[PDB]
């Protein structure tokens, strides 16, 4: 009975929410600790995501 | 010149206001040393004008091939073979032109991550961010909002 | 009705092999996943609690108004599952929404 | 004051007073729904 | 396919004019003037 599993957090921390909404190239990566999909400080507004796009 | 809808984030309070709509200002600043020719109308206009000419002799070139088709296979009931066809050529011509107008005038910033929707919305008319003079707030008179 | 919707949004992502909605955010920006699901009336049950169960002074929630709205189904979907800042256009098409 | 504050907060949440530890806080007992935080808050005003 | 070719030498023609801009006015910090610009050319190319 695990089909629906309510998300108890957004992919962004509250203190990162705005930064994400504003970088069009911001994308999620697997976290190390949690293993779940989050936005990293290092991928929001990066040179590497400009090149890589 | 722009209209957008945006949801917020994961939550549990339905009546709550959020910052989903902030995404209409999203642009990428990871590289902003030198001016983007794309923002420059003088630039775009030249690019269009080239396409305009490019289309011109496409229509000439197409109209030429039509003469060669009529001069060899159609009878003296040629008036409607010529009507239906040249008509269709001029459609396609205008369509191409309209698309070029589109590419360089209307939607030049669509596929650009350095130009935010709000930016370009104003930019198509030669307007800068500073030109947005008035903000009509929802301003519900609630503390939250 | 929100339960129906919730269960199918889940089952539909499964049918698409998307197991964690946030995987969309590996490929797309938060602002480019939208919800255009719609209802004819929907919330028909909360509507009653508002118009009839109140009229009887029966115990009824303080925000049944929330749940009567045609577009709060899509809202709970985004608030429980998806977390998008994409478009949110909600259709009332009656028998053809 | 324990039995009165418990019965009132367990009522606005609709779960037995065993489901509710007085150890917790009103922010945790709600989860996020701030309509129900606003209700428990204003109810205790009319009470105490 | 005609447009495809037509676009092809548009990008060639644009990339040519970029060499002439860098060969005369930008310094030896030319890497990002070249990055930002060729990047933008290829966008426009794909857009067309």
From Swiss-Prot, chain D:
Positions of modified residues (O-(pantetheine 4'-phosphoryl)serine): 34
Span of domain Carrier: 1-48
Record PTM text: 4'-phosphopantetheine is transferred from CoA to a specific serine of the Acyl carrier domain by the C-terminal PPT domain. This modification is essential for activity because fatty acids are bound in thioester linkage to the sulfhydryl of the prosthetic group.
Described purpose of this protein according to its UniProt entry: Fatty acid synthetase catalyzes the formation of long-chain fatty acids from acetyl-CoA, malonyl-CoA and NADPH. The alpha subunit contains domains for: acyl carrier protein, 3-oxoacyl-[acyl-carrier-protein] reductase, and 3-oxoacyl-[acyl-carrier-protein] synthase. This subunit coordinates the binding of the six beta subunits to the enzyme complex.
Family: Belongs to the thiolase-like superfamily. Fungal fatty acid synthetase subunit alpha family.
Further comment: Present with 17000 molecules/cell in log phase SD medium.
Subunit structure: [Alpha(6)beta(6)] hexamers of two multifunctional subunits (alpha and beta).
Identification of the protein by name: Fatty acid synthase subunit alpha
Organism: Saccharomyces cerevisiae (strain ATCC 204508 / S288c)
Boundaries of the shown chain within the full protein: 147 to 194 of 1887
């Amino acid at each position: 009975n695990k089909l629906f599993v309510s998300k108890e957090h957004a992919p962004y921390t509250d203190e990162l929410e705005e930064d994400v909404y504003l970088d069009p190239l911001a994308r999620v990566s697997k976290d190390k600790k949690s293993g779940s999909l989050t936005f990293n400080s290092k991928n929001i507004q990066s040179k590497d995501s400009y090149i890589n796009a | 010149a722009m209209a957008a809808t945006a949801t917020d984030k994961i939550g549990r309070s339905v009546p709550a206001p959020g910052k989903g709509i902030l995404t209409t200002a999203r642009e990428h600043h990871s590289s902003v040393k030198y001016a983007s020719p794309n923002l420059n109308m003088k630039y775009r206009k030249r690019q269009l004008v080239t396409r305009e000419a490019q289309i011109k002799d496409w229509v000439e070139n197409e109209l030429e091939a039509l003469k060669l088709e009529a001069e060899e296979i159609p009878s003296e009931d040629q008036n409607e073979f010529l009507l239906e066809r040249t008509r269709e050529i001029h459609n396609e011509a205008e369509s191409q032109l309209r698309a070029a107008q589109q590419q360089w005038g209307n939607d030049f910033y669509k596929r650009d991550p350095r130009i935010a929707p709000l930016r370009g919305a104003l930019a198509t008319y030669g307007l800068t961010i500073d030109d947005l003079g008035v903000a009509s707030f929802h301003g519900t008179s609630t503390k939250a909002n | 009705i929100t339960l129906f919707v919730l269960v199918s949004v889940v089952e539909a992502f499964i049918a698409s092999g998307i197991t964690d909605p946030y995987e969309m955010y590996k490929y797309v920006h938060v602002s480019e996943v939208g919800n255009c699901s719609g209802s004819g009336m929907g919330g028909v049950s909360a509507l009653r609690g508002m118009f009839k169960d109140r009229f009887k002074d029966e115990p009824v929630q303080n925000d049944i108004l929330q749940e009567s709205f045609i577009n709060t189904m899509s809202a709970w979907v985004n608030m429980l599952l998806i977390s998008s800042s994409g478009p949110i256009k909600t259709p009332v098409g009656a028998c053809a929404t | 004051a324990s039995l009165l504050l418990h019965v009132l907060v367990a009522h606005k949440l609709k779960k037995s007073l065993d489901s509710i530890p007085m150890s917790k806080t009103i922010k945790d007992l709600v989860g996020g729904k701030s309509t129900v935080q606003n209700e428990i808050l204003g109810d205790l005003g009319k009470e105490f």
